[PDB]
Amino acid sequence: RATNAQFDSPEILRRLDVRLLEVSPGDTGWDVFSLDYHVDGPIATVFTRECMSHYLRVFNF
Amino acid sequence: KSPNVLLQNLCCRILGRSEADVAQQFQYAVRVIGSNFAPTVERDEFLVAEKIKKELIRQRREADAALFSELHRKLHSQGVLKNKWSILYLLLSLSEDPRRQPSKVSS
Amino acid sequence: LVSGFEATINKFDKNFSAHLLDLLARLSIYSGMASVISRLDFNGFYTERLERLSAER
Amino acid sequence: LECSWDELWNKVQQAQDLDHIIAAHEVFLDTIISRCLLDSDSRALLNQLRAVFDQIIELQN
Amino acid sequence: AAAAAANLNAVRETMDVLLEISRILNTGLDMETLSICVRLCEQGINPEALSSVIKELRKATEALK
C-alpha cells in the first residue's frame, strides 16, 4: 500500500504469499526467506511445481 | 554401562575433567535427564528428513541433498540403534547453519 | 474503606488481567482473521506481558 | 532476464497449442539456470562467491 | 561367532554413517562423544534433555575462559 503497487488487480496480489523455510538455531533471516507465488487451477498444469521450485532457488540466490 | 555412570563418562568426554575431580556435572546431568527420562514425544523421523533436505537445498547444494538421502537410508537399513529418531533430533538441535560446511567422501 | 474499596478493585483487576491475557494467548493461536487481535490492541498499556511462556522438556 | 524473456514471449504468443507454451517455459527456465551460477559446473563460482559475500560485510565492520 | 562379528562390523558401519552426518551438519560432536551418545540412545533417552546437557557441558569449559 505504501509503494505504488496498489493499482494492481487482486489476482496477482492474491497469488503471492510469503513462505517460510525450516530454521536451524542461530541462522540469519536472509537464508530463511522465500516468496511462494503459488498458482492453482488449470494454470498449474501450464506452469508446474518443478518450475516453481527452481524459481525459488533462484529467488534465494 | 549403567545409564547414570555412562552419563558421567560423557561429562568426562566434553570437559577435560575427571570423574572424581568433579561430580557436580554428573549430578546436573542426572538432574536434567532424570526428570523426563523416556522420550517425551513420539518419533517424527520422516518430517525431519524432509527438513534436513530443506537445509541442504537452502544453501543451494543438490549433490549433498542426494547423499543425505542415502545417509538417512543406511540408518534405517541397519537398525542397530533402537531410536534412530533420537540421534537425528540431537544432531538437528546441535546444528547451526554452517553456510555450506563442506562435503567429502573419504574413499 | 480502602480495603472494601481499593483491595477489591485490585483483586478484580488481577483476575481480569489474568483472564484477559489468557484470552489474548488462546486467540493468538487462532490464524486472514487475526485482525481482531490487531484491532483490540492498537496502542495499548499492559495488554502484552510476555510473548511466550513455556517449561522445558 | 531480457533475452530469455523476449524469446519466451515470442514462443508463447505464437502458440496454437498449449504444449508450445509449456515447451517454451521450460526453455526459459533452463537458460536461467545455466546463465546463473546454480549448475553443477558453475558451482565452484558459487563457492568462490561466499568469499565476496563475506568480505563485503567484513569491510563494513 | 560369525554373526556376532558381523554385528561388530554392522555397528562400525552405522558409527561412520552418523559420523558423516555429524560433519555435514557441523555438529560440535566428534567420533568419541558420538560413541557415547549412541549408547545412551540405545537404552532410550529424551533428546530434549540430551541437547540441554550438551549445551551446558560445552559452556562449562567456557567458564575457564
From Swiss-Prot, chain A:
Source taxon at top rank: Eukaryota
Tissue expression remark: Ubiquitously expressed.
Subunit record text: Component of the gamma-tubulin ring complex (gTuRC) consisting of TUBGCP2, TUBGCP3, TUBGCP4, TUBGCP5 and TUBGCP6 and gamma-tubulin TUBG1 or TUBG2. TUBGCP2, TUBGCP3, TUBGCP4, TUBGCP5 and TUBGCP6 assemble in a 5:5:2:1:1 stoichiometry; each is associated with a gamma-tubulin, thereby arranging 14 gamma-tubulins in a helical manner. Gamma-tubulin at the first position is blocked by TUBGCP3 at the last position, allowing 13 protafilaments to grow into a microtubule.
Cystine pairings recorded for this chain: none
Localization, UniProt: Cytoplasm, Cytoskeleton, Microtubule organizing center, Centrosome
Listed name of the protein: Gamma-tubulin complex component 3
Its job: Component of the gamma-tubulin ring complex (gTuRC) which mediates microtubule nucleation. The gTuRC regulates the minus-end nucleation of alpha-beta tubulin heterodimers that grow into microtubule protafilaments, a critical step in centrosome duplication and spindle formation.
Membrane spanning residue stretches: none
UniProt similarity note: Belongs to the TUBGCP family.
From Swiss-Prot, chain C:
Tissue-specific expression: Ubiquitously expressed.
Subcellular location: Cytoplasm, Cytoskeleton, Microtubule organizing center, Centrosome
Disease: Cortical dysplasia, complex, with other brain malformations 15: An autosomal recessive disorder characterized by global developmental delay, variably impaired intellectual development, speech delay, facial dysmorphism, microcephaly, and varying degrees of cortical malformations including pachygyria, thin corpus callosum and subcortical band heterotopia. Most patients have generalized seizures.
Subunit-structure text: Component of the gamma-tubulin ring complex (gTuRC) consisting of TUBGCP2, TUBGCP3, TUBGCP4, TUBGCP5 and TUBGCP6 and gamma-tubulin TUBG1 or TUBG2. TUBGCP2, TUBGCP3, TUBGCP4, TUBGCP5 and TUBGCP6 assemble in a 5:5:2:1:1 stoichiometry; each is associated with a gamma-tubulin, thereby arranging 14 gamma-tubulins in a helical manner. Gamma-tubulin at the first position is blocked by TUBGCP3 at the last position, allowing 13 protafilaments to grow into a microtubule.
Role: Component of the gamma-tubulin ring complex (gTuRC) which mediates microtubule nucleation. The gTuRC regulates the minus-end nucleation of alpha-beta tubulin heterodimers that grow into microtubule protafilaments, a critical step in centrosome duplication and spindle formation. Plays a role in neuronal migration.
Similarity remark: Belongs to the TUBGCP family.
Protein name: Gamma-tubulin complex component 2
Species the sequence originates in: Homo sapiens (Human)
Lineage: Eukaryota, Metazoa, Chordata, Craniata, Vertebrata
Gene: TUBGCP2
Residues shown, of full length: 814 to 876 of 902
UniProtKB/Swiss-Prot annotation, chain E:
Keywords from the named record: Acetylation, Cytoplasm, Cytoskeleton
Subcellular location: Cytoplasm, Cytoskeleton, Microtubule organizing center, Centrosome; Cytoplasm, Cytoskeleton, Spindle
Gene behind this protein: MZT1
Family of the protein in this entry: Belongs to the MOZART1 family.
Acetylation listed as a keyword: yes
Coiled-coil boundaries: none
Source taxon at top rank: Eukaryota
Section covered of the full-length record: 11 to 75 of 82
Assembly and binders: Associates with the gamma-tubulin ring complex (gTuRC) consisting of TUBGCP2, TUBGCP3, TUBGCP4, TUBGCP5 and TUBGCP6 and gamma-tubulin TUBG1 or TUBG2; within the complex, interacts with TUBGCP3 and TUBGCP6 to form a luminal bridge with actin that stabilizes the initial structure during complex assembly. Interacts with TUBG1.
Organism: Homo sapiens (Human)
Function: Required for the recruitment and the assembly of the gamma-tubulin ring complex (gTuRC) at the centrosome. The gTuRC regulates the minus-end nucleation of alpha-beta tubulin heterodimers that grow into microtubule protafilaments, a critical step in centrosome duplication and spindle formation.
Main location: cytoplasm
GO CC field: centrosome; cytosol; gamma-tubulin ring complex; interphase microtubule organizing center; spindle
GO biological process, one term: mitotic spindle assembly
Protein name per the record: Mitotic-spindle organizing protein 1
